[PDB]
Amino acid sequence: GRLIPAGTGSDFVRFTQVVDQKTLKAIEEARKEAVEA
Amino acid sequence: LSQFKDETNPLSSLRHKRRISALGPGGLTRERAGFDVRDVHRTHYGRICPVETPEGANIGLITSLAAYARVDELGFIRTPYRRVVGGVVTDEVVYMTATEEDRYTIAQANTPLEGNRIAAERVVARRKGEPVIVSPEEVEFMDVSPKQVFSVNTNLIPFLEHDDANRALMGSNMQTQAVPLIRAQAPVVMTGLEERVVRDSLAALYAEEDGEVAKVDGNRIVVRYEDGRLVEYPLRRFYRSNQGTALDQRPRVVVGQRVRKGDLLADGPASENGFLALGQNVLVAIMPFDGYNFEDAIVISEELLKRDFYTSIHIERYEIEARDTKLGPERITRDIPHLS
Amino acid sequence: QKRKLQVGDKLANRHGNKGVVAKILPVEDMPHLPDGTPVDVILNPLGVPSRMNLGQILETHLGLAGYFLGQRYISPIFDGAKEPEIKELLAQAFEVYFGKRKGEGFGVDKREVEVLRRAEKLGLVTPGKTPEEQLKELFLQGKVVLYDGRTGEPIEGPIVVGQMFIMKLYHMVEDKMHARSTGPYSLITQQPLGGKAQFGGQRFGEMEVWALEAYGAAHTLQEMLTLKSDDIEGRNAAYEAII
Amino acid sequence: AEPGIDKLFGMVDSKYRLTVVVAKRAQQLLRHGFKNTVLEPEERPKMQTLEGLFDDPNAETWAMKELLTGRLVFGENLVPEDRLQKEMERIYPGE
Amino acid sequence: RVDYSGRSVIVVGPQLKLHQCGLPKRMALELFKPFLLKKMEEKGIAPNVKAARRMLERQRDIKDEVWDALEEVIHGKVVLLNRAPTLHRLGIQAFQPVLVEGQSIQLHPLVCEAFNADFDGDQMAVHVPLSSFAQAEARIQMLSAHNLLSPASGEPLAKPSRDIILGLYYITQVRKEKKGAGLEFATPEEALAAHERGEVALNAPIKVAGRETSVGRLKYVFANPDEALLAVAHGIVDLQDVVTVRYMGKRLETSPGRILFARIVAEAVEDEKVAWELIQLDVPQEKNSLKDLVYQAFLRLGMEKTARLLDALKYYGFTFSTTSGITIGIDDAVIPEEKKQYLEEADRKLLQIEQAYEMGFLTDRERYDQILQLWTETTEKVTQAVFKNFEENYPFNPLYVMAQSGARGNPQQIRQLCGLRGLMQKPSGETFEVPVRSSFREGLTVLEYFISSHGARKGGADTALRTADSGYLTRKLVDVTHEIVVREADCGTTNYISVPLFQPDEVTRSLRLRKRADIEAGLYGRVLAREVEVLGVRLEEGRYLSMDDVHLLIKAAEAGEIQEVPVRSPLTCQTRYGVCQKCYGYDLSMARPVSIGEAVGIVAAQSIGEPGTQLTMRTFH
Amino acid sequence: MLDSKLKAPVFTVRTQGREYGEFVLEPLERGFGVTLGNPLRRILLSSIPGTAVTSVYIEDVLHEFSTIPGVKEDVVEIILNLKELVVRFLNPSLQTVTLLLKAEGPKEVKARDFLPVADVEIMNPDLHIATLEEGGRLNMEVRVDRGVGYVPAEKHGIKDRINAIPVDAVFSPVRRVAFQVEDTRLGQRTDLDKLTLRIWTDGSVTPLEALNQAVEILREHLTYFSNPQ
Amino acid sequence: MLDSKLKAPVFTVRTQGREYGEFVLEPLERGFGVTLGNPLRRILLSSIPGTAVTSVYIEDVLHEFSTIPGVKEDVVEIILNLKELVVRFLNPSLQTVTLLLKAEGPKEVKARDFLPVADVEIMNPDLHIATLEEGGRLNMEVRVDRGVGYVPAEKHGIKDRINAIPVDAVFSPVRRVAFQVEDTRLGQRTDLDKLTLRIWTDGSVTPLEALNQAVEILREHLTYFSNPQ
């Protein structure tokens, strides 16, 4: 009753994320913040 | 073997009363064996229809006999064949066993006949399961009828002659699914047995002996025979058929009427005038419309519903029990505990 | 309960043409004959060549005769009516059809003539004969001119029409289109079960599984195997979530 | 059929990839608040009992209507798995 | 058993577009119950769920506001429909529901071919995609209007079925009527005049066999496109009439209907010229020409744009069909005059065979096998006879065009109506000595009928047996083939197979070009293992050969430049469990390469299990 | 006027009773008899209003599927016969008229047996309602209304008396329409359309009346093309 | 007004230029969009009378199948191009106008080359009649009329000059008509007709104008049912 090995359940696509350029600059701002003192 | 009655309409039931099945006792032909049995054997002539069997997994193993087919002494469907001594054809008939049928040279009914005289030199006959062009001098026996070749159910089809045996089966089983309409109608074109079907089935009520009519209720026709007697004939007003189709006898005779022996006093569930009637003759154009009739779709004119044409009465018999639970008897009361 | 005819219903002649009602048209615009009488049902031709029952097309022709000639007939099994005898009654019917038309005051349409033109270019009518004579020929063939009804223009090319008997078929319990959202569940097997009032779920067979397998329908299959039928804790949180 | 399904198919390396993108985008469109879109102003999603589709009818019909434009970005490993859901909650209100 | 399921009778939905399907609101209600409940709460119709529930527990209590809620819940969601035997992946398709009254389920006609569903009581189930994901896939990669081309063959399955062709065909056919006097206008000017007046008279038709231009072309010339049809509307020219017209840059001698068809397509997809390049207006539109049209449009213009053309064809076909007034009649099945001849000629010849036996020349057997040969020949003789009849005398016989058009009809079938069905076999299999002299037009006799009946049963018995053998097979195949799944990077093992374009033995030894079919089967959408320079073009390595390319290689083998073809294939793959992009090829239901992650194993196992139902079934071994 | 306008549709009429009405109109230009006949027909059938039995109350009967003693016909056959009944009221003031009839014993019950009502008339007197034997007691109240088209008994569900039973609504007073366009020869040019349409009617309204209503519906519709947007 | 009358045909329009014009109108009862669209269409094509080249006379040419020296195009190609010509006269006084044009040598002959006529205007100036080489002499007289529908050159047979040749009559500013009846849902009942008809026009008149004229012809015809006889 597990997800099918074949299809959208492909190891090649089971993992794929999406972004808005707005959330793109938001995460890099998180990286900028990493600079200590 | 003993099954629910098939009263979707008199015809349907009647047929279900004259079916011959394979499966059953479990000791005789069961599920395994098939194809040799399932095929329409040569001898099946006048003894079994070759069109009647159920279009489905269980095919050819279940079938109703033919028109003049009769079980003689021991279950051997004999079929009537008339005698033809020399080039002379008789009105005498011999119900022959399957076996004996092969010892003779038998011919078809289509043979131009002058009475007792066969009319063409090279006229068809079939010895033993083999089509043979025989001479008028070899024609020992002749077919009794075209009707005897098939079943009743099938005999009701107009020009069977021009219809593929395959689909003709469909037409024959379709009738078995005919539902009784409050408005019955006999075909504009009939074969000839519609009368005999309703009569031999027990749809319409016929007059025993000659006399006059006394009272014509909606529930009874008390007729007065000339013998000095009168009997009340109840009419199953509205009864529940096993499959939920109405069975009502509608009186067709007025008050004070001299009845001929065996004339319809009332019509059966599906009879118009002592004739079998199902569905209703309707004027029809035979062309394509948009897509409304595309693979096997039908377009219908609203007009057909304006007149109460295809309309039919149903009856489902819901049932409930007051059971005794150890928790307390289930009471049946107008009381419905929670809301309105 | 009264069961008046409706779209879901299935009707079929004695020959085998079986079929369902797909649309109930307003008398307003369905095919209508020259004299205002319109057709009740329109059967597709296509269902006739493949299947092989011309007997129905033979019935419709005798039927047309019986309509105008106001009479029923009895055509035995194989001994019955013959093609010439029917053309004969059709001949008699042309006079009731068109004879009254002559006396009632009018002749032929622009439409009636137009379809004749396309009909002679077809090969149904002997070129050079008068419309009156031509229409008889054409009628004897079993087809008559029909106008749209929606547009009033004719239907290019004669079309046959007539009195065909047709029955209505009994509706089984299955007919009662099932449809179940949530419902009971078997005791030992935890799969959906119906009965009295809850409809009982449909079966997802292997053949169907593969159908989805073929597609990239991963979840959709999972669901069918979990959320929809056996995932005890699944279906529950499923409903609630939806809720 | 559906709007520029070809155009869509073409923007992905695999057919089955397009389907995951759209679905995951539809996911986020609703979870973090439905105004998590990139193309609302002038010509946008619309239904007609009113022009009310502007708020919440079909999730992915949006997802696709955005992916068809070149604003979104779908990668195999674009932005680290857990930090994504955090930054998204911080910036998009509506709950 | 699925929790969000349903099932009802189906009924054709002619206006419906491939995209959607008609679903009984009454059904939708139960189906989408929870989705509706909540939606009730988001509106004033109910305070809460439990409320919304009791609100609908009874039929008479529903406010017409609820439908407006449901109709709103279903906005862009879609459902799946199943058919009785689910034989291939298209046995389940997704569509957008358009809620409708009553009991029946409105199905589109074009997909009645994928599911083997006819309308004599066929009932289809219906399921609901609950997750946003299940819905995503469902409508993205499972909706009808997206899987137009079959997985078995790169041939379309969304083809104008029965009624559409019949319509589309009748509109594009041209007529020919009476040849009496001279047919020569190619040269004299006294020929134009005389045969123009002679046509005005009663002697020359509008469509006469007169090479260059039958007077029907002489009389009418149409400047712009429209001009042509207006004359038609007014009753000047039928649609099937041969006229001359001015198109973009040519004086084209083509019929009204043909010109009209041109537009239909030209309109469906507005790249008018591109509509002309992929269409053949030089012939009556058969299902094949159509089929082709579809395919072409698919590669050329693009998927959705095709969908449009599909419905466009569906629409006009349907309409034009109704107006055409094609009908079945008893006099329309026409029996040839030659039938009597052929019969009698073969009749007397039977007499000879008999005199030849009465004497002792031919053995018991010889007689028999000689008689059958007489009929088998004679029967085939009437068959080409009837056709010739219609072909020459009634080009527009009802019963005819249907068969010609990819519409409906089988040569063998026609023969049974107009010609005659001649030989039926005995119970066992030994065919009968006597034929069935009759046709269905005339009374198939009492017994010739009983004779033909036998063979009917064997057909039926066979059919009932494949309703499960059709599965028998597919099971086996899927048991071995399920694991096979496209998961890859171009597998680096280049071991390849060579496809033969020539066969050695039909007639002992003669090398011959394989049939366009098989070849198409072998190289369609394959990946060239090695580079091949053939007629002038350099097919590079690894390239996916389009049907247009596979059409080049054959034209090249015709010329004599290649006898084999290097191409990747499943038989030579390296991916243990799985097959790769380059080795599978093209055919997803879509015409581009295969997309990684497609369940080929089964797609395959299926395409092979269905047709199996058509193959004969006497004894396994 | 004399030339093109005097050459105007000679509207001629032939009407017997309120059922049949033929209507000729010629000359007309090219293909106009059709242009007019067809719309009018479409209107004459779908558009025009009338009368039909909308509800019935037998006094001892509760459901439609019952049978009354001394009465040969069954409830369902009778309610059917009522649909056959054609009434005609004369003014708007009469929207819903309840006709009453009670007959006993050995008599045949025809439509003339209904007690007369002031503004209403029964065109269908001799229609057959029932055949009463002896001790035949039939007392009913049959509602009647003015509406348009067909309305299934299910759709309206009329409620005069709780034990009453609704009937289907056959509101088109028009029975059938028919039109012919034969050629007419007027001096100069032969091509001419002569439109004559034959109208049949249940009696409620008249062929002429109907026709008039029809043309108006069309007219009213042609005006709906006024305000662009 | 508020209930049944406010629920009235919302007549909406969309017209770009003088050629195309869509016209929507809903709601309509049952099967009315058809009832209306169809007649209007039949009128829009046959009735909205117009103009078309009815006859031509090349001076040296006798038959229609001839070819003129220095003239690339053949008589048949040119008479065809003339059918393409759209003219517009302003008043009834102009029933049959003969336009004249004569051009010589290395010039291209377009419709603007015809000598202007007082009450007549040519909307099709740049249309291409012929290409004259050298020593190219073309002097013609092309007749023009006001009529309705399509009339084959055979049907009229015009006779200005004995060596002239008739041309087919394309009498209409309207190019094509088209109407669709799609369902529309208005609250209670779903069954609803939505009539939208698309009209194309050569420019002479506008879609709207045409439509208006159309409806009137219908109206005018509905009035012809007045005086019985």
Ligand SMILES: CO[C@H]1/C=C/O[C@@]2(C)Oc3c(C)c(O)c4c(O)c(c(/C=N/N5CCN(C6CCCC6)CC5)c(O)c4c3C2=O)NC(=O)/C(C)=C\C=C\[C@H](C)[C@H](O)[C@@H](C)[C@@H](O)[C@@H](C)[C@H](OC(C)=O)[C@@H]1C
């Ligand atoms: C002895 O009672 C039972 C024994 C079972 O055991 C078992 C093993 O032994 C059997 C026999 C010995 C039989 O002789 C037999 C039949 O003769 C038969 C069918 C089955 N027919 N069905 C198949 C489904 N279709 C449907 C149409 C749409 C698709 C599905 C309709 C016809 C069948 O399976 C049979 C059967 C068995 O299975 N029928 C027909 O010949 C036929 C073609 C039509 C008749 C239809 C009537 C309507 C029907 O008669 C009805 C009144 C009932 O009588 C039956 C249901 C009955 O049930 C009860 C309870 O009484 C059983 C026969």
Ligand SMILES: [Mg+2]
């Ligand atoms: Mg993930």
Ligand SMILES: [Mg+2]
């Ligand atoms: Mg065994």
Ligand SMILES: [Mg+2]
């Ligand atoms: Mg055993």
Ligand SMILES: [Mg+2]
């Ligand atoms: Mg059989």
Ligand SMILES: [Mg+2]
């Ligand atoms: Mg089976």
Ligand SMILES: [Mg+2]
């Ligand atoms: Mg089995």
Ligand SMILES: [Mg+2]
């Ligand atoms: Mg015994």
Ligand SMILES: [Mg+2]
């Ligand atoms: Mg015999």
Ligand SMILES: [Mg+2]
């Ligand atoms: Mg004789």
Ligand SMILES: [Mg+2]
């Ligand atoms: Mg002997």
Ligand SMILES: [Mg+2]
């Ligand atoms: Mg019968």
Ligand SMILES: [Mg+2]
């Ligand atoms: Mg009757």
Ligand SMILES: [Mg+2]
């Ligand atoms: Mg008799």
Ligand SMILES: [Mg+2]
């Ligand atoms: Mg007594």
Ligand SMILES: [Mg+2]
């Ligand atoms: Mg007694």
